[PDB]
């Protein structure tokens, strides 16, 4: 019986009969799909529909051996703004001629009249005044000022450069005579200084450690990290872009949409930095200490929707081949390794690929 | 053959364990722990 | 093309004499409603002159009397030169933002800022590019480009070499360059080089070489609504929210800054203000909180004209437990003028059915048109227009060339009109689920 | 294999003349409704009219849902059939009129030819080159990657853009891997290790793959089926580029958003260009709103705008209600539970309750479909329940009775097995009598009211 | 611990004739309902039928949950048995419809078969190279059986696992090359003494034998809901456990339904339909019922078992009353199984079973009195007195629960009827439905 | 402390024949200008500015959602 | 546990070819308030010492289930080494130098729910944005 892939092809062929009730070529390609659907249209590495502009190659012969692959991917939705709006002060936050408000307001609201600047905090640092708690939350006036002004991504990178030392104190400062010692400048950091997690990392039988890992252990045990993706998005697009005929707009596109510091954080140190960090006479810290991009949940699909055909599908995509595989895996007890005959030459080549997948000798 | 200038090797077997350090790393900060800093 | 035949596709305009605003008995797809079409013509004059801010007009009439038709006529007679915003009142009930936010945004979409900017643009067929990469690339390069009238070499700066290599420009490509910014758009491929394009499949189209000057000062006219400026200024890529729609409740101090900035641009002559129109269909679906907002949003120099349509009689205002004409509170109806649309006479029904039959591809015998006109009087204009499509499909299945009375009669038998369907539920009352939830499944 | 309520329905069972055969394609009767549903099928296949509405009006169990499923089979798998209940419109993430538009645009299909322009090969060499950023504060950055790709037929060295190198970093590529680089997206896929390294002596289950045949550089032609909703969504929450927004968009929780009409009108223009280029064809389809009485006055008001759209699908509504209160409009009652205003837009196909002999014939079709053998006395007994109680009820007995029969070893269901099924499995009304009779008394053994 | 249904260990029916035994597997009486339930198990186990909604109806107690819990015990581990309380469908994360869709799809299993290779051997040598100040890692593992030795390259992921596991020479380890899990099993010889902090001593093992590799078939069952979650996301598969899944888009589920059919025809997957048990279904509202009408019509619908206590009762979200609190166009799709109140000879048996499960030794007189209390006050109340009387008897160091201990329990703890009387006899001192109360003596 | 690149001076406009660059005339006025500006804010502007990083400080805001 | 009194490699008796040094043991002296001990550690602990930047006089612990170490801080015995240093100084551990004891952990099952549904320790950008 035909596989579902064969069945779909065979159906699309009998749709042609609606014109005709070329039949010789039709019956010949009916014979092809009944041999294997890869004789008709071979399965290949595939991806969602891409809804975007790109620069395609016009000539293969003139391309040569050395070529630069620029990043041409661009949205077809193409939002066009005059530079009066997008560049020349129609954006309120960006200072310039014809935006005299923005430069003033930037300085005064973020520095002068900003409660988080160290000169302002230091006036309120005492008594029942509003920054009185700062003495005990394990952060400096400089760090308080940084956390108020950097965004949650930038703060998260800075948080990579930190150590769970209050959790280590729980391991060490343990006896009654240690009196649960805590740095007084970290006094209010209560839940960090005491929680079960740090202790469970250290015990010789990881009972409380395992109990906290159940969800991720179960996930991997089910093989859901390795199972084939049963669905994907049918279309995919790059972000919409402003089209504005200014050089500043082009510069700004690179600064935001291809943001260097975010990218550097995600992908980590460069090879020269690893050398300079490693051969120096003294240690040196790196902007991110490591690549901060997460590990992908799917071990094979990772961060892309590209899918690659497999030999498992190849066998099952022809009903004959699936049936033949079942009987060959017992005729192996008799031999007859090449007692096979074909009406089509390319079918013999496909059978070499199948046999080599089975590692069956000719 | 010469080892990778940047990689320190640990190896363990029935006799126990050793670490071996490229001479390109002695005289760096990485050598200090092995008693062979700048 | 993509645009299929919809209910209103036959409406091309208002059908009104531009000199006198006298409506013609039929033109541009609108039949009858002459007093209503005259009033809608007076409103277009107000919209196009821009002088008056925040008038609200209500189109009041029974169902299927051309209230939307007249609204489509106005949109078509303003054309693309004016912001026209079409709001179903059901849309204001966002979960992303409050109702009044959604009403502010709708008002702000309906005022345009018109801005004129020149660019030099260079357009022609590429005769040659050479690039020397040494080996880091982009060290130097030369572009030869032509029109039918001129040819030139350009020495290229290194970032133009990056633009060229990014867009894979090759000999024969017809390109345009916005040289104030250096984006390349590949307008096409020259036919004269078709053999060079060895990788392009046979479906590939080819252009003729451009013509005239290689460089032109093209002038572009942009219209951007006040809402777009607001959303741009809301976050680092706020303009993306004009598409994904996840604008929060944009803070009102942002809008007030923008209102000041735009008045500055008007006095400097850097920009022109283009007041549009907001159309609110089924305005009776707004609630009492919306109406009290709209009251005061109208009283502003940056208010569009608003146009509203209602089918409702004396009906309960939403968000309250009392009834008012059109379903709208009298506090609001005080600031509104009403245009009323009447039912059609049979000769108007005949014409509307004819126009609908010519917009669709339907050859209709005179007796079928007479029969459909009788059905229109008795079942309503919408039902008869729906029967046109049906009868065509029935005629086609029996291979007939014209829709005959025979085909209309199949349609009338197969598809019930509203009144026949009401009788059906009354006779089938025990078998249908009543308002008490009771039903009997037995024979 | 698994058998559901509608597994016997195969189509409308019409002649080429468009007349219903009295029993065909799984149907019995409904002939006038099947003929009207035939004309709806032909309206859809004509792909010429936008925004026409159809109401299937009729009591519960009269085959309204069967007919809608038959339309879907007459149309076949090329055309979008988008079935929903009115209860599905009430998203917590987005406004109810948003899920109306999403479902309207799922009902419009597009077939498009796509050129994948791609590079393939075994990675023979790979070498980064760096920028000395002086004062960015992020340190150095890689300025390009040079990579050597080898296929069976030829070889290239590619100087990749940094954003394409980031794609290779995400894909964990190493020398000797076989990779795929789609220049459309700038995405990179690692296909495997080259078969030249095929060895058992690696702890990880590597994909050893043969060297790519043909040229390193290829163009692939692919025909894709998408809906307008897939394009809308792709462009609302972009994930296809190698820019930072696309990258982080793959890490954040998926989230529906109130896609604006600006995006929809922009995507119409995009699709119109694919049509004018000849790479696409429009396949407008049908949205089936089952349980349409569960919509509300805001939904119906929105359909009055939405159905005016010049690319709106065909909308089939089913309702089972007599004169009923419109939801969200508690003062307004109308037939079908549909506002009088919106009812004027629809063509109403009434469906009618079955005769005793039609019910008997449905019992046989359904028995054949579940694969169960009945005596004629059994078929008559079941048909009696279809008349006296309900069609749905009598069809539910076939599966219980088959088990009860098999339990006695008889392979054919006879009257004793239906007689037992009647007593094990009550209908709604026998159960309602138990409620009322016991409800004479409260205390411990009363039903809770 | 002992719970309300811990004694229920099956449905208590003859597997051949489906005849309910009067007592078996902890179930007593209800024979018609237990026979009807035994037939529904056959529909489930055969799997061919999709979307049959069965309503267990009856007054409170009478074992509606007990029968449904007996079925769960009869299906065993492989079949899904999702239990919903209808109150779980109301959510702030997702619509009711989405909450129902997820629960329906939780009830369909997908039994994937995969083949894996595991290594096992004695580690003879381990070598790891580490970059200074960087992530770059490589290594080699020399591993042995009594009959093979080979040197395997290790990637970075293996080296992380190897050091997490502290793999050392002489350890017996196994490695699943598919998952990459490493497990230690013991040591071929003592832990070497020269180094300190060498960790806890392991088991001894003799060296593994035969080939290093072997193939092993492994079977995993996942619901269609898990597949939905995994495929709606690039990242965040923690949502499978955390909730937080959002409203998954329907075009994703369409794709999954096709692929699962394709996986079935390929022989990659076996679909395993189970049941959704909805308890107290009268808590659903009119929109939920309208969704369920058509969710049942899919060929991927599970069999849905429902329980209700309600008489003619108001439907939620609705003005009007209906039997069971369920709407009639919903009940048209539903067969009803009726449970009945128990005979005193049945109460005595049920109480005896509870006493055995709770390990309580009733005297025959205590059982007689508890049976009489069971008639007057209900089975649940009398079952609570069993545990209480056990405690009271123990405090006086009695060997057995006597009538005196049951009488004292009855004295201490009010019957739900006596409490209603107590409420009536103090209407002024309890707070009324209109909030008035008097605190003065 | 604000600054803006207006463009490249068009005295350099013929460095190349094509470059992706925006050539502008040299400013014809005085190179230094002193202006009295009366600036208005509100207490709410101060609230907003102190509650959260604003504008170009908060680039990740471009992702929307949370 | 202790302050690190000493760190001292031992060369191996069979050094590897082509390598400048081969280390067979890494001695660490640990001092607590109650004793002094020479830990003859496995050489692989060099990794933690470099990454944790362990100095003589820093307070550390070494856990036997991993063999790694963690730095608690610099001992306050050195708080006068400089007029200005960016160190928090921490007391010397007041336990034994070797702490082996049973520990009793009390958790609710809700704590296990949250510890699984909201894992706390994640090193990636999304975890770190999460916890902020
Ligand atoms: N005067 C008219 N001329 C032409 N077409 C009309 C006229 N009035 C109504 N129609 C058409 O008849 C249908 C019903 O009228 P419409 O304006 O939609 O109803 P309503 O007034 O309820 O909004 C529409 O397709 C509309 O285009
Ligand atoms: N004419 C018919 N022929 C065969 N089966 C039918 C027919 N009409 C209804 N049925 C079947 O009877 C049941 C009830 O029909 P259904 O369409 O669900 O009613 P409703 O109008 O409530 O949707 C379904 O199993 C359906 O397949
Ligand atoms: N027939 C029975 N056999 C054994 N135990 C029963 C029986 N009926 C009820 N029980 C037990 O008594 C208690 C009440 O029954 P339950 O099933 O909870 O009633 P409901 O129908 O209200 O859910 C449960 O602990 C149950 O185990």
Q: Could you write out the three-class secondary structure of chain A?
A: CCCHHHHHHHHHHHHHHHHHCCHHHHHHHHHHHHHCHHHHCCCCCECCEECEECCCCCCCCCCCCEEEECCCCEECCEEECCHHHHCCCCCCCCCECCEHHHHHHHHHHHHHCCCCCHHHHHHHCCCCCCCHHHHHCCCCHHHHHHHHHCCHHHHHHHHHHCCCHHHHHHHHCCCHHHCCCCCHHHCCCHHHHCCHHHHHCCCCCCHHHHHCCHHHHHHHHCCCCCCCCCCCCCEECCCCEEECCCHHHHHHHHHHHCCHHHHHHHHCCCHHHHHHHHHCCCCCCCCCCCCCCCCCCCCCCCCCCCECCCHHHHHHCCHHHHHHHHHHHHHCCCCCCCCCCCCCHHHHHHHHHHHHHHCCCC
Q: Count CB-CB contacts under 10 A for residue G10.
A: 15
CB contact under 8 A, F21 and C157: yes
Ligand 1 site, residue C68, Cβ cutoff 6 A: yes
Residue E252 near chain D (CB below 8 Å): no
Q: At what angle do helices D376-388 and D415-424 cross, to 10 degrees?
A: 30
Residue G132 near chain A (CB below 8 Å): yes
Give me the half-sphere count of Cα atoms (radius 13 Å) on the Cβ side of residue E359: 4
CB contact under 8 A, D93 and C95: yes
Q: Domain locations in chain G?
A: 1-104
Q: Are F21 and F14 in contact (CB under 8 A)?
A: no
Q: Are A293 and A264 in contact (CB under 8 A)?
A: no
Give the residue, by CA position, lying nearest to ligand 1 atom 20: C64
Q: How close A116 comes to chain F (CA, Å)? A: 7
* Closest C-alpha to A174, from G78, G65, G101: G101
Q: Are E281 and E55 in contact (CB under 8 A)?
A: yes
Give the residue from F6, F7, F10, F19 with the most C CB atoms within 10 Å of its CB, the best one to mutate.
F19
Distance C18 CA to ligand 2 centre (A): 59
Q: Are A350 and A39 in contact (CB under 8 A)?
A: yes
User: Annotated binding residue at C66?
Assistant: yes
CATH code of the domain made up of D356-437: 1.10.8.60
User: Annotated binding residue at E335?
Assistant: no
Ligand 3 site, residue E61, Cβ cutoff 6 A: yes
Q: For a pocket test of ligand 2, which of D65, D352, D383 has the largest count of ligand atoms closer than 8 A to its C-beta?
A: D65
Q: Are A86 and A113 in contact (CB under 8 A)?
A: no
Ligand 3 site, residue E275, Cβ cutoff 6 A: no
Q: Are D84 and D248 in contact (CB under 8 A)?
A: no
**Strands, DSSP E only, in D247-399?**
280-284, 286-290, 314-319, 323-325, 333-335, 346-350
Q: What's the fold here for domain G1-104?
A: OB fold (Dihydrolipoamide Acetyltransferase, E2P) (2.40.50)
Tokens 């090329």, located at residue:
D78
> What angle is formed at CA A275 by the lines to CA A271 and CA A276, rounded to 5 degrees?
115
For D299, the enclosing helix (H) or strand (E) is helix D297-306
Q: Which of E166, E197, E235 minimises the CB distance to G62?
A: E197
Atom of ligand 3 nearest to the CA of E61: 19
> What angle is formed at CA D123 by the lines to CA D121 and CA D125, rounded to 5 degrees?
140
Using CA atoms, how far apart are residues E387 and C300, in angstroms rounded to an integer?
Answer: 76
Distance C384 CA to ligand 1 centre (A): 12
Q: How many residue pairs from chains A and F have C-beta atoms closer than 8 A?
A: 73
CB contact under 8 A, A233 and D186: no
Q: Count CB-CB contacts under 10 A for residue A76.
A: 19
CB contact under 8 A, E312 and D432: yes
Q: How many helices (H) and strands (E) does chain D have?
A: 15, 17
Q: Do chains B and A touch (3 or more CB pairs under 8 A)?
A: yes
User: Annotated binding residue at C64?
Assistant: yes
CB contact under 8 A, A208 and G70: no
Ligand 3 site, residue E344, Cβ cutoff 6 A: no
Give me the half-sphere count of Cα atoms (radius 13 Å) on the Cβ side of residue E272: 19
Ligand 1 site, residue C310, Cβ cutoff 6 A: no
Ligand 3 site, residue E29, Cβ cutoff 6 A: yes
Q: Which residue of C has its CA nearest to E320?
A: C436
Using CA atoms, how far apart are residues A310 and A319, in angstroms rounded to an integer?
Answer: 16
CA D7 vs CA A162, D24, D351, D408, G97: distances in Å: 62, 14, 20, 28, 76
* Closest C-alpha to A263, from A77, A81, A74, A71: A71
* Closest C-alpha to D362, from D396, D404, D410, D325: D396
User: Annotated binding residue at E86?
Assistant: no
Using CA atoms, how far apart are residues C130 and A202, in angstroms rounded to an integer?
Answer: 65
Q: At what angle do helices A345-358 and A319-331 cross, to 10 degrees?
A: 50
Q: Are D214 and D153 in contact (CB under 8 A)?
A: yes
**Strands, DSSP E only, in E189-311?**
213-223, 269-273, 275-279, 303-308
Q: Are A169 and A193 in contact (CB under 8 A)?
A: yes
Using CA atoms, how far apart are residues E266 and A322, in angstroms rounded to an integer?
Answer: 9
Give the residue, by CA position, lying nearest to ligand 2 atom 23: D65
C255-289 burial: b if 16+ Cβ within 10 Å, else e: bebbbebbeebeeeebbebbbbbbbbbbbbbbbbe
Q: How close G3 comes to chain B (CA, Å)? A: 17
Q: Do the first three CATH levels of D113-223 and D356-437 match, i.e. the same topology?
A: no
Tell me the residues of C at the E interface, defined by beta carbons under 8 Å apart: 433, 436-439, 441
Give the residue, by CA position, lying nearest to ligand 2 atom 11: D63
SS3 label, residue C145: strand
Backbone dihedral region of D248: left (phi > 0), alpha (psi from -120 to 50 degrees) or beta?
A: alpha
* Closest C-alpha to E338, from E35, E108, E2: E35
Residue C233 CA to its chain's centroid (Å): 25
Using CA atoms, how far apart are residues G5 and E58, in angstroms rounded to an integer?
Answer: 78
Residue A109: list chain F partners with CB under 8 A. Answer: 41, 45-46, 49-50, 54
Structure tokens of A103?
């430069």
Q: Which residue(s) pair with C316 in the sheet?
A: C323
Q: Locate all alpha helices (DSSP H) within C269-326, ordered by sequence.
A: 288-297
Structure tokens of D141?
């950055």
Ligand 3 site, residue E27, Cβ cutoff 6 A: yes
Q: Which residue(s) pair with C364 in the sheet?
A: C403
Atom of ligand 3 nearest to the CA of E3: 25
Q: How close A90 comes to chain C (CA, Å)? A: 7
CB contact under 8 A, D252 and F62: no
Residues sharing a CB contact under 8 Å with residue E378, sequence separation 6 or more, in sequence order: D444, E60, E61, E416
Ligand 3 site, residue E371, Cβ cutoff 6 A: no
CB contact under 8 A, A149 and F2: no
Q: Are C203 and D278 in contact (CB under 8 A)?
A: yes
CA torsion C129→C130→C133→C137, rounded to 10°?
-10
User: Annotated binding residue at C31?
Assistant: yes
Q: Do chains F and E touch (3 or more CB pairs under 8 A)?
A: no
SS3 label, residue E138: strand
Residue F64: list chain C partners with CB under 8 A. Answer: 235, 240-241, 244, 246
Q: Which residue of G has its CA nearest to B23?
A: G20
Phi, psi of A49 (to 5 degrees): -55, 130
SS3 label, residue E184: strand
Give the residue from G27, G43, G52 with the most B CB atoms within 10 Å of its CB, the best one to mutate.
G43
CA E39 vs CA E374, E376, G12: distances in Å: 31, 34, 76
Q: Do chains E and A touch (3 or more CB pairs under 8 A)?
A: yes
* Closest C-alpha to A318, from A14, A32, A35, A42: A35
**Ligand nearest to the CA of residue D342, numbered in listed order:** 1
Using CA atoms, how far apart are residues A193 and A185, in angstroms rounded to an integer?
Answer: 12
Give the residue, by CA position, lying nearest to ligand 2 atom 10: D63
CA C82 vs CA C252, C304, E432: distances in Å: 25, 11, 66
CB contact under 8 A, B25 and A274: no
Q: Do chains G and C touch (3 or more CB pairs under 8 A)?
A: no
Using CA atoms, how far apart are residues A151 and F54, in angstroms rounded to an integer?
Answer: 9
Q: Which residue of G has its CA nearest to E130?
A: G47
Using CA atoms, how far apart are residues E268 and C178, in angstroms rounded to an integer?
Answer: 55
Q: Locate all alpha helices (DSSP H) within C285-345, ordered by sequence.
A: 288-297, 330-333
Q: Are E300 and E268 in contact (CB under 8 A)?
A: no
* Closest C-alpha to D349, from D57, D85, D4, D115: D57
Residue D312: list chain C partners with CB under 8 A. Answer: 6
Q: At what angle do helices E364-377 and E379-395 cross, to 10 degrees?
A: 140
Residue B37 near chain A (CB below 8 Å): yes
Domain D113-223: CATH superfamily is: RuvBL1 DNA/RNA binding domain (2.40.50.360)
The dihedral through the CA atoms of E275, E277, E281, E285 has a sign that is: negative
Which value in Å is the resolution of this experimental model? 2.9
* Closest C-alpha to D234, from D250, D221, D219: D250
Q: Which residue of E has its CA nearest to D435?
A: E311
Residue E191 near chain A (CB below 8 Å): no
The set of chains that have 3 or more CB pairs under 8 A with D is A, C, E, F
Using CA atoms, how far apart are residues D351 and D319, in angstroms rounded to an integer?
Answer: 11
The set of chains that have 3 or more CB pairs under 8 A with A is B, C, D, E, F, G
β-pairing, C183-189 vs C173-178, is antiparallel
């Amino acid at each position: 019986e035909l596989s579902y892939r064969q069945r779909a092809m065979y159906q699309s062929l009998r749709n042609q009969i609606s014109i005709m009730d070329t039949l010789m070529n039709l019956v010949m390609q009916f014979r092809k799909v009944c041999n294997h659907p890869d004789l008709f249209e071979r399965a290949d590495t595939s991806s969602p529909f891409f809804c975007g502009h790109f620069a395609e190659t016009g000539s293969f012969l003139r391309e040569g051996t050395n070529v630069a692959l620029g990043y041409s991917t661009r949205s077809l939705v193409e939002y066009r703004l005059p530079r009066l709006i997008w560049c020349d002060g129609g954006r309120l936050d960006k200072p310039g001629p014809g935006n005299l408000v923005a430069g003033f307001r930037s300085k005064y609201l973020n520095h002068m009249m900003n409660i988080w600047t160290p000169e302002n905090i230091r006036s309120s640092l005492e008594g029942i005044e509003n920054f009185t708690w700062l003495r005990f939350v394990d952060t400096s006036l400089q760090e308080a000022y940084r956390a108020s002004h950097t965004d949650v991504f930038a703060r998260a990178v800075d948080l990579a450069s930190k150590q769970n030392r209050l959790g280590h104190m729980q391991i060490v400062y343990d006896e009654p005579e240690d009196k649960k010692w805590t740095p007084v400048h970290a006094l209010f950091q209560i839940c960090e200084r005491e929680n079960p997690k740090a202790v469970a990392e250290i015990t010789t039988e990881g009972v409380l450690r395992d109990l906290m890992n159940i969800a991720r252990v179960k996930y991997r045990e089910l093989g859901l990290c390795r199972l084939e993706k049963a669905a994907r998005p049918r279309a995919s697009a790059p972000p919409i872009e402003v089209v504005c005929d200014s050089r500043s707009a082009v510069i700004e596109r690179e600064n935001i949409m291809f943001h260097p510091a975010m990218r550097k954080a995600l992908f980590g140190p460069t090879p020269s930095e690893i050398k300079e960090a490693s051969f120096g006479p003294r240690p040196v810290t790196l902007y991110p200490p490591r690549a901060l991009l997460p590990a992908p949940d799917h071990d094979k699909q990772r961060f892309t929707n590209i899918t690659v055909p497999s030999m498992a599908r190849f066998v099952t995509d022809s009903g004959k081949l699936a049936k033949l595989d079942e009987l060959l895996r017992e005729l192996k007890e008799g031999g007859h390794r090449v007692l096979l005959y074909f009406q089509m030459t390319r079918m013999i080549d496909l059978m070499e690929e199948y046999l080599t997948y089975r590692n069956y000798k000719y | 053959k010469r080892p990778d200038p940047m990689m320190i090797r640990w190896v363990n077997n029935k006799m126990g364990s050793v670490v071996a350090v490229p001479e390109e790393l002695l005289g760096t900060h990485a050598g200090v722990v092995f008693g062979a800093g700048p | 093309g993509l645009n299929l035949i919809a209910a209103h596709s036959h409406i091309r305009g208002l059908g009104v004499d531009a000199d006198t605003l006298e409506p013609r008995p039929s033109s541009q797809g609108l039949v009858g409603q002459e007093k209503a079409r005259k009033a809608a013509a007076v409103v277009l004059e107000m919209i196009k002159q821009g002088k008056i801010a925040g008038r609200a007009v209500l189109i009041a009439g029974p169902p299927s009397t051309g209230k939307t038709a007249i609204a489509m006529g106005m949109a078509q007679s303003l054309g693309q030169d004016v912001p026209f915003t079409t709001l179903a009142a059901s849309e204001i009930f966002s979960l992303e933002m409050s109702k009044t936010e959604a009403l502010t945004q709708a008002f702000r979409k309906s005022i345009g800022v018109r801005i004129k900017e020149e660019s030099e643009i260079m357009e022609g067929e590429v005769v040659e590019i050479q690039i020397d990469r040494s080996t880091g690339g982009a060290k130097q390069g030369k572009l030869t480009i032509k029109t039918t009238d001129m040819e030139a070499i350009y020495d290229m700066g290194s970032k133009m070499i990056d633009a060229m290599t990014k867009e894979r420009v090759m000999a024969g490509d017809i390109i345009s360059i916005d040289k104030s910014s250096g984006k390349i758009t590949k307008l096409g491929r020259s036919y004269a080089r078709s053999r060079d394009y060895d990788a392009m499949g046979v479906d590939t189209k080819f252009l003729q070489c451009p013509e005239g000057e290689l460089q032109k000062r093209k002038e572009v006219v942009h219209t951007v609504s006040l809402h777009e400026i607001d959303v741009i200024n809301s976050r680092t890529q706020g303009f993306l929210a004009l598409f994904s729609g996840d604008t929060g409740e944009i803070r009102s101090e942002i809008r007030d800054q923008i209102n000041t900035k735009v008045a500055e641009w008007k006095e400097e002559g850097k920009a022109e203000i283009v007041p549009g129109v907001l159309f609110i269909d089924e305005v009776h679906m707004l609630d009492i909180e919306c109406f009290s907002y709209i009251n005061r949003a109208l009283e502003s120099d940056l208010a569009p004209i608003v146009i509203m349509a209602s089918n409702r009689g004396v009906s309960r205002i939403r968000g309250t437990d009392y009834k008012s004409p059109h379903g709208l509170p009298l506090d609001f109806l005080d600031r509104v003028v009403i245009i009323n649309t009447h039912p059609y006479t049979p000769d108007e029904l005949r014409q509307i059915l004819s126009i609908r039959a010519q917009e669709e591809e339907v050859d209709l015998t005179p007796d079928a048109l007479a029969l459909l006109t009788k059905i229109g009087q008795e079942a309503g204009l919408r039902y008869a227009s729906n029967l046109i499509t049906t009868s065509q499909l029935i005629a086609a299945k029996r291979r007939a060339k014209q829709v005959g009375v025979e085909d209309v009669q199949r349609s009338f038998k197969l598809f019930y009109d509203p009144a026949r369907s009401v009788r059906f539920v009354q006779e089938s009352e025990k078998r249908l689920i009543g308002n008490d939830g009771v039903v009997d499944f037995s024979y | 294999h698994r058998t559901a309520a509608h597994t016997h329905i195969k189509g409308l069972g019409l002649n080429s003349s468009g007349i219903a055969e009295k029993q065909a394609a799984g149907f019995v009767g409904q002939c006038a409704a099947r003929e009207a549903c035939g004309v709806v099928v032909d309206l859809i296949k004509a792909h010429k009219m936008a925004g026409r509405g159809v109401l299937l009006a009729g009591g519960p169990g009269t085959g309204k849902t069967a007919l809608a499923l038959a339309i879907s089979q007459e149309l076949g798998t090329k055309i979008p059939f988008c079935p929903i209940t009115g209860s599905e419109i009430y998203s917590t993430e987005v406004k109810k009129t948003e899920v109306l538009m999403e479902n309207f645009r799922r009902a419009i299909g597009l077939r498009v030819r796509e050129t994948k322009d791609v590079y393939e090969g075994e990675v023979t060499e790979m070498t980064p080159e760096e920028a000395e950023n002086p004062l960015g504060g992020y340190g150095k950055t890689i300025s390009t990657l040079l990579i050597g790709l080898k296929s069976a037929r030829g070889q290239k060295k590619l100087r990749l853009d940094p954003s394409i190198y980031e794609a290779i970093q995400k894909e964990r590529v190493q020398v000797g891997d076989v990779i795929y680089i789609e220049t459309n997206t700038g995405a990179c896929k690692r296909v495997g290790r080259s078969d030249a390294y095929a060895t058992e002596f690696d702890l990880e289950a590597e994909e050893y793959v043969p060297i790519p045949k043909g040229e390193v550089h290829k163009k692939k032609e692919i025909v894709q089926d998408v809906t307008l909703h897939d394009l809308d969504v792709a462009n609302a929450r972009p994930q296809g580029g190698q820019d930072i927004i696309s990258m982080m968009g793959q890490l954040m929780k998926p989230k529906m958003t109130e896609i604006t009409d600006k995006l929809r009108m922009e995507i119409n223009k995009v699709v119109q260009k694919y049509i004018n280029q000849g790479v696409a064809e429009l396949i407008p389809g049908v949205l089936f709103i089952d349980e349409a009485h569960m919509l509300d006055i805001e939904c119906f008001t929105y359909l009055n705008k939405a159905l005016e759209s010049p690319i709106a699908p065909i909308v089939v509504l089913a309702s089972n209600r007599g004169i009923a209160t419109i939801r969200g409009a508690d003062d307004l009652k109308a037939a079908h539970g549909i506002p009088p205003d919106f009812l004027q837009r629809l063509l109403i196909i009434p469906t009618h309750p079955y005769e005793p002999d039609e019910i008997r014939r449905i019992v046989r079709i359904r028995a054949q479909t579940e694969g169960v053998q009945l005596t004629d006395a059994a078929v008559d007994r079941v048909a009696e329940h279809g008349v006296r109680i309900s069609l749905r009820y009598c069809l539910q007995l076939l599966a219980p009775a088959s088990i009860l029969a098999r339990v006695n070893g008889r392979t054919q269901v006879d009257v004793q097995d239906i007689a037992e099924a009647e007593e094990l499995f009550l209908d709604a009304r026998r159960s309602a009598n138990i409620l009322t009779s016991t409800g004479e008394s409260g205390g411990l053994h009363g039903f809770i009211s």
